[PDB]
Design a protein around this ligand. Structure first.
Ligand SMILES: *SCC1=CC(C)(C)N(O)C1(C)C
Ligand SMILES: *SCC1=CC(C)(C)N(O)C1(C)C
Ligand SMILES: *SCC1=CC(C)(C)N(O)C1(C)C
Lengths: 143, 110
């Protein structure tokens, strides 16, 4: 038994310009098993997470964009440029969405893969995160 | 519009109540029942993904909540604290997660 967060994969066709400040581009129904006294947190895979920051990358690995995973107005989560987590204790069951940090102005997109893994978080700032559960690979495709 | 009805409306302590859902939309991704009058996240009762029948309990899940593919929720062993409003969130693969709220009352017997 551990804090297992089920993050689902999602591929959607959208532009970087549709991301106007806070635009929930796809509602992911995520539920966390356990964590009665632990904080639930979302962390991106090491291929999408560097220096304690999460971002999406293109095929040419030149265009790097940072995206914050926030709740679809379901609860209050602590925003971090690397690991997103809620201060409120207890399990969680709602919908999360990918929000862009600052309007991108629809910079020429293509294919971006961002692997987000759910799990729990320990204390704060120290980056004591552990991905337990399911990992959700979100694919950003322009069409 | 999505309509939630409670049958019976006047439930007795020690019985079950069936929250029937009427006018269910299409493109169902998953049903989510919450305890309140809005779509929260910390006060979720239960989530049910029809596609894979993947049901996940929430913080407000007592274990008396029985969810059906028609989004209806049957709660057994109804207590006095059950008296109130319940809200359903219809997660659809089209962003429109149509929300609806229903309510029922509980009374003691003998
Ligand atoms: S919605 C308030 C609430 C929170 C939690 C501690 C999960 N609960 O059992 C209730 C439903 C009272
Ligand atoms: S139960 C959730 C689930 C299982 C599996 C068949 C692997 N899936 O694709 C989803 C994520 C729907
Ligand atoms: S319950 C309110 C709500 C939230 C969100 C998921 C953004 N929605 O589409 C609605 C308006 C149903």
């Amino acid at each position: 038994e551990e804090c297992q967060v089920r993050v689902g994969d999602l591929t959607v066709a959208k532009t970087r310009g549709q991301l106007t400040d806070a635009a929930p581009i796809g509602p992911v129904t995520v539920q966390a098993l356990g964590c009665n006294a632990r904080q639930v947190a979302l962390k991106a895979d090491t291929d999408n997470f560097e220096q304690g920051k999460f971002f999406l990358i293109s095929d040419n690995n030149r265009d790097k964009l940072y995206v914050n995973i926030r709740p679809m107005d379901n609860s209050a989560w602590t925003t971090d440029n690397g690991v997103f987590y809620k201060n409120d204790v207890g399990s969680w069951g709602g919908t999360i969405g990918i929000y862009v940090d600052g309007q991108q102005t629809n910079t020429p997109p293509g294919n971006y893969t961002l692997t987000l893994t759910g799990g729990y978080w320990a204390k704060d700032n120290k980056q004591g995160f552990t991905p337990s559960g399911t990992t959700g690979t979100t694919k950003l495709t322009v069409t | 519009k999505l309509t939630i009805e409670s049958t019976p409306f006047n439930v007795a302590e020690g019985k079950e109540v069936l929250l029937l859902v009427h006018n269910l939309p299409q493109h169902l991704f998953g049903y989510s029942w919450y305890k309140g009058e809005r779509c929260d996240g910390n006060c979720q009762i239960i989530g049910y993904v029809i596609g894979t029948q993947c049901a996940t309990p929430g913080p407000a899940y007592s274990g008396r909540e029985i969810i059906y593919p028609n989004a209806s929720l049957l709660i057994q062993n109804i207590i006095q604290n059950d008296t109130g409003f319940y809200t359903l969130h219809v997660i659809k693969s089209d962003l429109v997660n149509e929300e609806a709220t229903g309510q029922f009352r509980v009374y003691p017997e003998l």
